């Protein structure tokens, strides 16, 4: 929709639309829906990436065996960057297959978020109603109805918190990767990042 009636705003940039380059004023509404969807997907991906990178940096691994002959701690014996290359290619292909199925089924839904849908509102069951494919009714977001006890005001406040945490998480994961690739850039990463 219009960039004016959106949920970013925030008190950090005073309480108005932050946009200093005028990107949202030069483009139409459809591009703003695409920008919000990309921002929210980026924030969620970056939140998961930041948590996983911190877990890998703390050398925390599952008790067990990743592949037969390959312990979780054997992969996690180095930093998080040199752990993705230690995972077997089959496991990474299965992870990317599940991610591909999720992305495809998310975008295949009706009222596309440009053509009527809400940008960033991924519906609960992306694999429902598809002919030739069956899945359990585990929801994608909130398999447990945590956000069913909340009211509208609490949902709006937590959506704002999600947007702020997403922006912070993008900054954080880019800092982690840049600190590993170019040491001494981010001073907050001691050695194991």
């Amino acid at each position: 929709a219009l960039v004016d009636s959106m949920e970013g705003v925030g008190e950090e940039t005073g309480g108005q639309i932050w946009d200093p380059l005028g990107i949202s004023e030069a483009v139409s509404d459809e591009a703003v829906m695409w920008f919000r969807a990309s921002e929210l997907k980026h924030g969620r991906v970056a939140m998961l990436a930041s948590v996983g990178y911190l877990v890998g940096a703390a050398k925390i691994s599952f008790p067990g065996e990743l592949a037969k002959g390959v312990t979780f701690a054997s992969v996690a014996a180095n930093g998080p960057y040199q752990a993705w290359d230690a995972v077997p290619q089959a496991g990474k292909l299965q992870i990317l297959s599940i991610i591909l199925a999720l992305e495809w089924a998310t975008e295949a839904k009706k009222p596309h978020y440009m053509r009527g849908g809400v940008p960033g509102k991924i519906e609960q069951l992306p694999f429902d109603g598809i002919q030739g494919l069956w899945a359990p009714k585990i929801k994608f977001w909130d398999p447990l109805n945590f956000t069913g006890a909340l009211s509208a005001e609490q949902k709006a406040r937590k959506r704002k918190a999600e947007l702020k945490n997403g922006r912070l998480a993008m900054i954080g994961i880019i800092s982690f990767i840049t600190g590993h690739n170019l040491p001494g850039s981010v001073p907050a990463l001691d050695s194991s990042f």
């Binding site: 008190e11 950090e12 940039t13 005073g14 001073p187």
Partner: protein
């Protein structure tokens, strides 16, 4: 002009022997008060640090940067000598956090102190626990005046420490080092 800051020890009147007002507008006086308050608060933090570290103080227990060979007690007791012994990563972290905080302070107050607003009221970084959340408007002005006076005294304090470090035997109570 009228503002805050004045009180006793001057006669209830504004102190400026060299003029430095009557060439100042509301915007310029707001800048004067914002610079005075920032300098005041930084100087109070600076005296509270140098006085605690140099005189006594248990110092922070721990190590300070597990990889490089530095210890909290290995920094020393001098002010300027221990600052150089702080690692470059720590110095850059301190300066970057301060710069981010002030850039957000400039871009976060929408009535800007140079365009309205109140000088010295920066967002965040004040009472997170709300100690002054119930104070009366009359009492808050007294606390602001006390902040201004203590800050000016602390400005003189930091410059006394700097003078004693650089040119010896200046500030006669302060020793030669």
């Amino acid at each position: 002009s009228d503002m805050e800051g004045t009180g006793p020890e001057t006669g209830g009147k504004v102190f400026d022997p060299m003029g430095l007002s009557k060439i100042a507008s509301a915007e310029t006086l707001a800048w004067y008060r914002a610079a005075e308050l920032k300098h005041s608060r930084v100087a109070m933090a600076a005296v509270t640090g140098w006085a605690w570290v140099s005189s006594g103080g248990p110092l922070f227990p721990g190590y300070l940067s597990v990889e490089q060979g530095v210890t909290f007690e290995s920094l020393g007791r001098d002010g300027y000598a221990a600052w150089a012994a702080v690692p470059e990563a720590g110095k850059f972290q301190i300066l970057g956090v301060i710069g981010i905080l002030e850039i957000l302070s400039e871009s976060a107050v929408k009535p800007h102190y140079m365009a309205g607003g109140t000088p010295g009221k920066v967002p965040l970084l004040w009472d997170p626990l709300g100690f002054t959340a119930k104070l009366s408007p009359e009492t808050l002005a007294r606390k602001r005046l006390a902040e201004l006076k203590n800050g000016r005294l602390a400005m003189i304090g930091v410059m006394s420490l700097v003078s004693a470090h650089f040119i010896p035997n200046s500030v006669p109570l302060l020793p030669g080092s």
